[PDB]
Design an enzyme around this catalytic site. Structure first.
Site, PDB file in Angstrom:
ATOM      1  N   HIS A 101       7.717   2.829   9.798  1.00  0.00           N
ATOM      2  CA  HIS A 101       7.103   3.330   8.575  1.00  0.00           C
ATOM      3  C   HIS A 101       8.027   4.299   7.853  1.00  0.00           C
ATOM      4  O   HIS A 101       8.182   4.224   6.639  1.00  0.00           O
ATOM      5  CB  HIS A 101       5.750   3.981   8.808  1.00  0.00           C
ATOM      6  CG  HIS A 101       4.883   3.960   7.594  1.00  0.00           C
ATOM      7  ND1 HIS A 101       4.348   5.092   7.028  1.00  0.00           N
ATOM      8  CD2 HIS A 101       4.502   2.931   6.802  1.00  0.00           C
ATOM      9  CE1 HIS A 101       3.647   4.764   5.960  1.00  0.00           C
ATOM     10  NE2 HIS A 101       3.727   3.456   5.800  1.00  0.00           N
TER      11      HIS A 101
ATOM     12  N   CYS B 279      -1.218   2.218   1.841  1.00  0.00           N
ATOM     13  CA  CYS B 279       0.177   2.022   2.193  1.00  0.00           C
ATOM     14  C   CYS B 279       0.320   0.681   2.899  1.00  0.00           C
ATOM     15  O   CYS B 279       1.368   0.044   2.837  1.00  0.00           O
ATOM     16  CB  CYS B 279       0.646   3.168   3.077  1.00  0.00           C
ATOM     17  SG  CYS B 279       0.589   4.782   2.262  1.00  0.00           S
TER      18      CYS B 279
ATOM     19  N   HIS C 225       9.047   5.768  -1.196  1.00  0.00           N
ATOM     20  CA  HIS C 225       7.761   5.250  -0.739  1.00  0.00           C
ATOM     21  C   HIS C 225       7.045   4.575  -1.896  1.00  0.00           C
ATOM     22  O   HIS C 225       6.612   5.244  -2.833  1.00  0.00           O
ATOM     23  CB  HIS C 225       6.904   6.388  -0.193  1.00  0.00           C
ATOM     24  CG  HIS C 225       5.599   5.937   0.385  1.00  0.00           C
ATOM     25  ND1 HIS C 225       5.512   5.075   1.453  1.00  0.00           N
ATOM     26  CD2 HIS C 225       4.326   6.225   0.037  1.00  0.00           C
ATOM     27  CE1 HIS C 225       4.244   4.847   1.740  1.00  0.00           C
ATOM     28  NE2 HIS C 225       3.503   5.536   0.895  1.00  0.00           N
TER      29      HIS C 225
END
Lengths: 547, 54
Positions: free
Chosen positions: A289, A159, A329
């Site tokens: 995030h 990520c 995401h």
């Protein structure tokens, strides 16, 4: 100025995200709260969990599309290359153009790319055929086609991968190994479409009480970076500044590989502050995030606060938001997406809203929380913003940006100048006119001396050439529709393609050279204006995929 | 509300109220029972998904 010799500048951007053709469209999408997931009504007989298994997808139109011929590629060859590589290739070209530069002219450039393993080779028939498309081929293919000398390699931290690229560029450009650095990220998957973190309804409701998971996405983008001092001296177009970035890993503190840990996040954040010394009170917005998990989102703020609190804190002065809410995401391009959004907000001095928020998570303690959730547009009257990305792996990243503040724009001293427009195919040249065309009107007053300047320099000499010698925007514009409008010989125009006097030829400026450019080799560099972000080469729309 | 034939009336008010390895022990008096037990849990699990094993 002061702490600019230790900083980077974002001087070019190119990106494609769900619902976004370009970084400009992107921004205007987020500012207005637009959400780019998509849903299906009438298209297997599994209407069951969701068909969570995931009922809606977040999609990038034209992930397959490509312009292979641009790079001397066989069509057969494109079908073998990964979509992520193709996309990163187009974007890397695009990003440097948006910078106003010709790659070839900045050999001293570093390239850091990252992408997912989508097992693309697997969909090819059964194959003689050599495996070299590897992760390494991506940055290296790009360096080769743009003529870059800077260290070129591939980096991945799940990520957190883009900030890892951002980290490399920060060290690299500081260490003088390279003058420019190019960082890009992509995820495109190769499919059709409890016990996990999947959202119940396909809505990433970050900081919401009912946040129950996250949804997947696809994206790609690249930015071009320069040392900050150099950028101002060199006169480049700067969106924003990168002050510092930090990396680390959780260790084995938390229980599990997939667990995010409070202590680990805290340290990068602390670590970066010490690096830049930047005072938290200094910070307007933080792009979190913001996955949308019940337990992830309490931790982020917990970590943020714990650091921020020991400082000249106490308040609720900072805006906190996640663009994941808009796009989803994007595993490897998550960092890239947050990065561009923060860079844009500083560029425009506005705060983008965070959508899908109705109530505040009780756990957040937002009130003791130095930062309030975003729900509206903002007024801002330099400012600094922070960005977080936390890997599935346990590798954490935090970064801070600084607004770039001063423009003393000046009217146009001279009333006529020359655009040189070109493309590798005539069909392309026409659209370029269109794309340019649309722009002029969309941006109502843009200087052409710089518009002129940036096309003279910062755009390569393609074979199909159309050179314009106008003096007024509307003047230029319609004459463009004149060129687009195909065979009316009306304009102060010059058809392009439609011999080498290379030897020792002087050239005197003062007059119309377009003809000489129209089938020639002229170096428009005498008079000067600033480089500026305009439209970029329109690539063809050929789709390639393995049956 | 419930009102009897007798003439007895009743009224009531109700209010609204707001790991990695598991072990499931299943037992029955007989083996088909224990087997029928299995279809039903299986069937239950199918339908209700976001159902916590813990």
């Amino acid at each position: 100025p002061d702490y600019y010799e230790d900083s980077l500048a974002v001087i070019g951007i190119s990106c494609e995200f769900p619902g976004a053709k370009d970084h400009y469209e992107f921004w205007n999408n987020i500012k207005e709260g637009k959400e780019s997931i998509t849903f299906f009504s009438k298209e297997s007989g599994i209407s069951e969990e969701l068909a969570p298994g995931f009922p809606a997808k977040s999609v990038l139109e034209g992930k397959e599309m490509f312009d292979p011929g641009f790079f001397g590629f066989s069509p057969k060859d494109a079908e073998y290359m990964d979509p992520q590589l193709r996309m990163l290739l187009l974007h890397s070209w695009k990003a440097i153009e948006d910078a106003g530069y010709i790659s070839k002219e900045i050999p001293e450039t570093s390239v850091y790319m990252s992408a997912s393993t989508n097992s693309y080779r697997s969909l090819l028939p059964e194959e003689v055929s050599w495996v070299l498309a590897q992760s390494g081929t991506i940055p290296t293919m790009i360096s080769h086609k743009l003529g870059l000398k800077g260290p070129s390699y591939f980096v991945h931290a799940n990520c957190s991968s883009s900030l890892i690229g951002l980290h490399s560029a920060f060290q690299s450009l500081q260490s003088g190994e390279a003058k420019y650095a190019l960082v890009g990220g992509a995820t495109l998957h190769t499919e059709s479409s409890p016990g996990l973190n999947f959202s119940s309804d396909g809505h990433i409701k970050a900081f919401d009480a009912d946040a129950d998971g996250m949804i997947g996405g696809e994206g790609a983008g690249a930015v071009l970076l320069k040392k900050a001092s150099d950028a101002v001296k060199d006169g480049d177009h700067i969106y924003a500044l990168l002050r510092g970035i930090g990396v680390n890993n959780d260790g084995a503190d938390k229980v599990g590989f997939y667990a995010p840990s409070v202590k680990g996040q805290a340290e990068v954040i602390q670590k970066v502050i010490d690096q830049t010394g930047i005072h938290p009170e200094t910070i307007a917005y933080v792009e979190a995030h913001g996955t949308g998990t019940k337990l992830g989102d309490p931790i982020e703020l917990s970590a943020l606060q714990s650091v921020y609190g020991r400082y000249t804190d106490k308040k609720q002065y900072c805006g906190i938001g996640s663009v994941k809410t808009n796009l989803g995401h994007l595993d490897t391009a998550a960092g890239m997406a947050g990065c561009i959004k923060v860079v844009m907000s500083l560029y425009h001095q506005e705060i983008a809203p965070s959508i899908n928020y109705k109530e505040p998570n009780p756990n957040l303690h937002l009130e003791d929380s130095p930062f309030f959730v975003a729900e509206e547009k903002k007024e801002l009257t330099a400012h600094r913003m922070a960005l977080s990305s936390f890997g599935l792996g346990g590798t954490n990243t935090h970064a801070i940006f600084e607004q770039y503040p001063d423009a003393s724009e000046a009217a146009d001293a001279a009333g006529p100048f020359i655009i040189p427009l070109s493309a590798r195919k005539k069909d392309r040249l026409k659209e370029y006119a269109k794309q340019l065309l649309a722009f002029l009107e969309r941006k109502t007053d843009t200087d052409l001396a710089d518009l002129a300047y940036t096309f003279q320099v910062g755009r390569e000499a393609m074979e199909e050439r159309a050179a314009f010698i106008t003096s007024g925007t509307a003047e230029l514009k319609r004459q463009l529709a004149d060129f687009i409008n195909d065979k009316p010989a009306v304009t102060g125009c010059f058809r392009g393609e439609k011999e080498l006097i290379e030897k020792w030829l002087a050239k005197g400026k003062g007059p119309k050279l377009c003809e000489m450019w129209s089938k020639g080799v002229a170096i428009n560099w005498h008079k000067h204006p600033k480089r500026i972000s305009l439209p970029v080469y329109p690539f063809a729309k050929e789709p390639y995929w393995p049956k």
